[PDB]
Amino acid sequence: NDIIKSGLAEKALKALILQCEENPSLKNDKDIHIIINTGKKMGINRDNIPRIIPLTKYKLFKPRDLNILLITKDPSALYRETLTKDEHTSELFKEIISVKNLRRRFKGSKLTQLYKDFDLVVADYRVHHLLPEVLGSRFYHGSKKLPYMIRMSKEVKLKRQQMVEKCDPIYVRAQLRSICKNTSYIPNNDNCLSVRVGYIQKHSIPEILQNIQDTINFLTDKSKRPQGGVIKGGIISIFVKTSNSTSLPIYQF
């Protein structure tokens, strides 16, 4: 909790929020990111699979706030019908589409239109590895709209047996609520890391500071492996920045 106590963190956030108001070029910048300089190489190849960091104290977003796109295994008749009928998930998804239909309908410039319309993309884990070919480069560089893996039902796969295909609406809604409130990170085989911690004009400075400490604790705690505890050997320095603002230091070793 030393980071929150340190005044350096508060002043930088005050400077960052203020100068976004002042500078026109940063007018479209809305999210707050922290840049973490790990001492040693993580050694994890970037799998493009988001890793959720639980933020206990505060919730970044709710499902009702964001455009959510669900990509399902073909055929989507069962999942679309079950989700659209159940009251809990009736109004949860902006659009439900299958992989084959997504590939056929959207190509080229249409992929850019899909990128803008949707704030969050979620996909069945079975079809996640196919998406990089389909969605294109734009979704898969930068990590702003990187798809999230979700599981339709609590059924499990057993070798030499066929999984029963079912859709559990309450489980899907529960996963999506967790995805929105909890921030996410992607491992890479280099020191630098970027994690979203706050949203300008929604989160106060004390809340963003708490989110940062939650991120640091989860990422450093070896007990939380394999999802957490990826930052071995401590953190050399931590910065704060928006998408187009530079790194303002908040901690240095």
Partner: peptide, 24 residues
């Protein structure tokens, strides 16, 4: 929860708690 076909499942699966299941 693990799936042999897709090793990526066990990392980066959304944690689910009692608060999530409970209706708003």
């Amino acid at each position: 929860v693990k799936d042999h076909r897709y090793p990526g499942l066990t990392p980066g699966l959304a944690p689910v708690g009692l608060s999530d299941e409970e209706d708003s």
